[PDB]
Each structure stands twice: as C-alpha cells, then as structure tokens.
Amino acid sequence: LSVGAAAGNATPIPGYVIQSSAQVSDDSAVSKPGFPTSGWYPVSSRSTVYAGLLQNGKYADPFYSTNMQNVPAAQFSVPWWYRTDLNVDDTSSRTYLDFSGVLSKADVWVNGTKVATKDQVNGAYTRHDLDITAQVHTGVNSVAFKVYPNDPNRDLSMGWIDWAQTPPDQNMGIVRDVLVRRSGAVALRSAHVIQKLNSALDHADLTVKADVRNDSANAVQTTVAGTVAGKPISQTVSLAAKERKTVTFPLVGLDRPNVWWPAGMGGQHRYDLDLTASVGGTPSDAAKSKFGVRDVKATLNSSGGRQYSVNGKPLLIRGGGYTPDLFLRWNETAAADKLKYVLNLGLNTVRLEGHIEPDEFFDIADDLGVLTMPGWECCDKWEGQVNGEEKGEPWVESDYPIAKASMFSEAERLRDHPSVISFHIGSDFAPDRRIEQGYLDAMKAADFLLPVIPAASARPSPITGASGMKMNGPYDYVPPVYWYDKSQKDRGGAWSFNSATSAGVDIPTMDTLKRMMSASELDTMWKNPSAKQYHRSSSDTFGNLKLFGDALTKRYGASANLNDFVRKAQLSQYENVRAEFESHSRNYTDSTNPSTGLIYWMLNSPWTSLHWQLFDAYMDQNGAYYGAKKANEPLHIQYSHDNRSVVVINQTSNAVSGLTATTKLYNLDGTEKYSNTKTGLSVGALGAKATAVTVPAVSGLSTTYLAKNVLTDSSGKEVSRNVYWLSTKADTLNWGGSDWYYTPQSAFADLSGLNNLGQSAVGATANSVAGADGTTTTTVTLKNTSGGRLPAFYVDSKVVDSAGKPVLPVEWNDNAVSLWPGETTTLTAKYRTADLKGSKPSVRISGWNTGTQTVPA
Ligand SMILES: N[C@@H]1[C@@H](O)[C@H](O[C@@H]2O[C@H](CO)[C@@H](O)[C@H](O)[C@H]2N)[C@@H](CO)O[C@H]1O
C-alpha cells in the first residue's frame, strides 16, 4: 500500500495482517516497520476478525449446521491487532487516517507511536480524522490498530438481537474502510449540499456547505472553489493555525431540476458537488460528492399514523427489514443484487434496524430508487438507558458523547443520499430527553433535515412526540385473516404503520436446506417441529418451529416426509406473506385508521435461516418470496380473506382504465362453482383501489376450494393472475390468549383437500439469449396440456445448470403460476451469464400436482 503526494488523495487500505493480542508482548512494536508478522492472518478490507479467519479457511462454513458452535469464543475476549505497511513517496503533503466501523474500540499506532486511545476511538459509527503527519516519514511506514472485543450490550456498536445466532467474535474488527488522506496545509472535510425544492417541483435553490481546517503552523488564506450542479461556486476565507471554519456558499438556483424519484415514479438522477480548497494558488485538498433533488415528509395523519410522501406524493411504504451478512462480510455486487431483489419483489423500501451499511449500499439504493429507513437498534446498548428489563446496560457519562458523535457521523454520511426517507432515533423504546436532545443536536449540526422518527413502536419521545408507528407483533404464526383485522388496538392488524411484523417461520427451498442442514437435522425438522433449530433464533421464544408446525399440520394436513413438509411450508408461506401485504395495500385508502406502511420481518437473513426472510442467504426464492412478489405487483388483483371482496390495486403513478376483472370459483375436482366479469374498471394511481365484486357465500363448495383472479389491460394483455386456495372452514383467533409475538387460533381452516387434488400436466418450452452486457435472458413458455378440467397448480420454474443446481441470483417477471387446461403463460428470467459458470442453462419445472421435469434452455 502506497500514497501519491498529490493533495486530494483518499486511498483506502486494501488489506491487513491480523492476530490476537495474546501473541504480542510489546504493543508499541507492532507498528514499527519490519516488525515480524509470521503466522499472522492476511484479511481483506472491511473484515471482522472471524470473517478474516474464515477467509483463511481456519474454520468450517458457519452457514452449515452447527459449525459456528465449534468455534471457541474465548480467543475473542482479548483485543486483536490489525496491521499494515504504508509506503509514503514524499512527506510534502500532510497525512491523515480517516475512518469508522471499529468494533468496539481501538488504539491506533503509527511507527511505534500510539496516536489515539480506545477512549478517543470508541463506537462503530464514530468517525475519526487523525492528523499523523508528525509520525509519518518517506519510504515504508506502519499503522496498527489494537481493536478491542465487542459486547453489544456494553458498547455503542452492533448486536444481533434475536435474528440468528451470536457470531463467536461478536463482530469485533474494522468493518469499513480506513482511508489514507493526503493534503497540504488545508484539509477539506464535510462538504454537503442543503437542497430545497419548491412544491411545483420546477425550481430548487441549493446551499453548499463545507469545512476547511488549517493543520499547518501558520495562518493561511484559502479559496474553496468548484461546481455544484453545473454552477460555479467560490469562497475565500481566512484561517488561523489549527483553525476549522464552516464555509457557507451563497444560494444557487436550479431552474427545472432533474428531480430524483422512487423506482417507477421517474428518473434516479443525482447531481455532483466538486470542490477544491486552495492555498498559495495550489490545490491543498479536494472532495467529490453527489446529491439528489427530492423532497420527503413523514407527517401524522388524522388517525395518528405516520405518512410518508416523496415530492408531494404520498406513498404506502411497502418493504422489509434489511440485514447485512452475520459476520458483516461486504461485497458491492451482492449489495446491488439484494437491492435489485427489492424491485423484483415490487417493494419500495427497506428498513435498517442498526447495522447501517457502508456508503456504497446507499449509492446503489439511490441509483435503483429503493427507499431506505435507517435508525438505531433495540434490545442492546443503544436503548440500555430506557428499556427496563430488556438486554442492554445503563449509560455512564462517557456513553453520551459517543452516542452523539455516532449520530453526527451517520447524519454526515446519510444527509445527501436521496433514498433516505428518515432516521429512527429509537426502535422499541424512544430515548429520554437528554439522549434525544443529543441526537437532534447532532442532526442540526450536520444539517440533516430528513424526518426524525422517535420510535418504531408506539412509544413517544419527549421532544419529537408521537411516532405514528406500532410494534405489537406478531413475529410467529397467525392465520392469513389476522392481517385483515382493525378491531384489536393492541395487535398487528393492517392499520397504522407496521414497522416490524411477520408470521415467523419461512422454510427456504430444498436446494438451500441441503446446504444448510444435515440429513438428520432435516429429518428432525419435519417429524418434530417442536425441537430447537440452530438456524432459527438464539432466543427461547423462537428457538423452534412448534407454532408453525401445529399450524401447518392442522391446516394442510400432517406431513408424510420432508418433501411433503417442505411443499406444504411453501404454500403456507406464500399464503401468509401474500395476505399480510394485500391487506395493508387495501386498507391504505381507508377513511379512518388506514394502513400507512408495512415492513415485513424480515426481507433477508444474516445467514442461512429458517425464519423472517423473503429471500434466503444464497439469493434463492421460495413461497414467501413469490407470495410478496405477487402481492406487490404494479397492476394487481387480490381477494380479501375477511369479506371475499375482489379488490384491484394500482401501484404505478398513472391512473389506468379499461380493466376487465374475471373472478372464478372451483372445487378440487375442477368444477366451476361461480363466475364474474367486471368490465371497464378504472383505478387511480399510487396504491388506489377498486372492488370488482364481493364473492357471495356459495353453497356446495368443497371443504378446500380454489379462487382464480384474472386482470387484463384494455389492449388484451394479462397483467395480474392470482390464485387462492380457501376453505369453508374458517381460521379464527382466540384474541384473549394473545402474547406479544403472536395470536393463538381457536379454529383452523381445512386446506388438506390439496393432498388429494388430481394430477395435471405441463407443458414447457424454453430458450435463452445472452446479451453483450453479460446477462442472459431465458424465456420459458408454460401450458396446461391435460385433457381434464383440473388446473396445473403452483407451477414453479427455476433456472438451473447441468448439475440441477439453481443459477443465482435471478429475477423473474412472474413465477409460481397456475394454469387451467389450454391456458398459457410466457415467463422471463434474467441473470448474469457468469453465474452459469460455463454450463448450459436449463429450466426446472415443478408443480404441486404436475411432478418435476427439466427442459433444456
Ligand atoms: N424483546 C422484544 C422485542 O424483540 C420486540 O421488538 C422487535 O422484536 C423482533 C422479534 O423479537 C426483533 O427481531 C426486533 O429486532 C425487535 N424490534 C418488542 C416489541 O414488539 O418487545 C420486546 O419485549
């Protein structure tokens, strides 16, 4: 690792060699050039200690079975050393280390000199700008961090609450870049752009602000100059030695701006800011950044619910809680792939309960137009001052400055990313008056002007007041019809802002299960859902799958084997997830106590998991994935579980007309028991609704029966198809036996008729085209080819290689389809050609009642 004396440079350290402090008797030696590093582990940038060890193949894959449990934890109760060499070609310019992402705290050493202590460098989110000119010399230099162990209850850091299992190193390390910075007498820092757009959206007057710091021994004059959005800006100011000033540039108008819009509402353009700070007529430093022209409000409506709007357009928030990799392994591509999945799912937002991702994540979200909901996390140090019996230690005087500094640093990162619609200063508990003032003050200081939400629960903060959100559960199984209830003010019904709720277990696809659990573990899974699974939660509330398994047995029938359990798990996850979203969609436009947002719990998992996920750790797509995708289609037909209303949802930003909504009922022997065609439907923009018909109570329906919704646009084209499997027996709730994380059932619906649905057939043809942009698009055509009256039900197509393994990540236009005899559908799958790994592409088609076939592609 080198540096160029050219003033402006901000090169990240590309790697380190790491080792336990157990191996080091003389702290000061580690940073002296030529210190012997034999037996040290080389790790890439942004590594936890444990991620660093795995990179070196020192332990088995923790995604598989109980591998993570065989890792001795004790070795991570002492500090570890992160160490690298640093070539300096010319110490003409000053040298800085600028960084964050240290868990939990660190000593910083340069060339035998301790330049900062763990007291000065403390907290994952705190930024640090260390002037190390005094210690740097020409040639080979050395920098070493003594990173201290991490405890999320004690440290203003990251913890994993109850999502998965505790990583053995408890995430200790450096999980962001350490930047080596070079500049002259004057350092440029904190350059940003306050932007205020008018309500006609055709003018913005922009305010550029940036700090300059004179780290030389004498007074200087410095000119700060460059462009913002195609406009010259320039300011000259004076500076004493060691002095820092905030330069505020004069206002700049931008007549007709390229407004930034969420996915599906317009472009995702960003403008540039580009400043050079100069001394004696020479660049001393320089900073390039981006920003979006976009307004965002989150106001409380008349029923007391939080309501987002972007560029004056109100939106129902539809998304899921986002989590990074359990050992915080970063990969830019993987981050874009995940955000791209949000758009495949048709969601508009992700929430980050702490674990706030590096800058690139937000760059991508900005470009994709995916909205982000960052904030602090519950259930550990962050709320330890205000959460009573909940895990997390009470604050001491020294916690407050770190807390505030953390807020300032994150606000400083987030402020100019248009995808950000708010920061959450609380999650389960809102902070007290002291801590909230610190948080609000840090925001003002950074010019963070985005909505501030006191909590994701219902608890209000002293100063910002009501949240307009709720966290009543559930997080484990409830019947689909639960989601439709507005009568229980203490429950997770579709009203207000559901900031974190799901129905628990989300069994991943077979291809995934086999990679994550041994045959014996999988055997136990279906036979005894009541037993602990290492790949659910470390929490006792969610250590097992009892609640899911009783429900799955009683509703769909007892399980014969693994395949039976799994295919039943997928229909239940498809059924539940769909209902959860479709209910919130419908109740959006309700006059009184409407639904304002829904954050599914969760969008993804930190590792290979059995719950709280839409996509799994390998990017694979199951029942719950398909269920949300269906529920969130842009032009969509649904059916209400509470009252049989056939509703139509238009998520797009244009009103739409000439819509025909064909709705049919069938028994399990294929006999049509009802039919409706509503023609000339007109549904307005951005999640407006129209009823097509309320299905009447029909007699002679089989115990288990189907519903077939079809929606076509005025040019023909089938735009939405939605198939329900229902029961003349109803799911009912024993509301009185409710606990915080679910509501128990008194009655169960009977969908076991599905066990006996007669065989059908499909009916498949596929071919592929590889683009010059290194993607492949595979086109499959499905047909119900049988001569009966039975549908080809829950047909699932997967791009696979010759090994029959799924090509991932992948994005379908539609999947898990149901076709009545003679009907046809054409599907599109897009994926990177390289993920095929030289193999020829194939498609694996599997139905509930059509068996499995794979056709070439
Ligand atoms: N200890 C619970 C707390 O976990 C819960 O809030 C959410 O719970 C999810 C499931 O436990 C969890 O994954 C998420 O991180 C939490 N924000 C609250 C409120 O429902 O109650 C506490 O008793």
Curated annotation (Swiss-Prot):
Reaction equations catalysed: Hydrolysis of chitosan or chitosan oligosaccharides to remove successive D-glucosamine residues from the non-reducing termini
UniProt keyword terms in alphabetical order: Carbohydrate metabolism, Chitin degradation, Glycosidase, Hydrolase, Polysaccharide degradation, Secreted, Signal
Chief localisation class: secreted
Organism in which the protein naturally occurs: Amycolatopsis orientalis (Nocardia orientalis)
Gene that this sequence comes from: csxA
Residue range from the parent sequence: 42 to 898 of 1032
Task of the protein: Hydrolyzes chitosan and chitooligosaccharides with retention of anomeric configuration. Has maximum activity on chitotetraose, chitopentaose and their corresponding alcohols, with a slight decrease in the rate of hydrolysis on longer chains. Has no activity against beta-D-glucopyranoside, beta-D-xylopyranoside, beta-D-mannoside, beta-D-glucuronide, beta-D-galactoside, beta-D-N-acetylgalactosamide, beta-D-N-acetylglucosaminide and alpha-D-N-acetylglucosaminide.
UniProt keyword annotation of Translocase present: no
Similarity section: Belongs to the glycosyl hydrolase 2 family.
Coiled coil location: none
Annotated protein name in UniProt: Exo-beta-D-glucosaminidase
Entry EC number(s): 3.2.1.165
pH-linked activity: Optimum pH is 5.5 with chitotriitol as substrate, and 5.3 with (GlcN)2 as substrate. Activity is lost below pH 3.5 and above pH 8.0.
Active site per database record: D428, A500
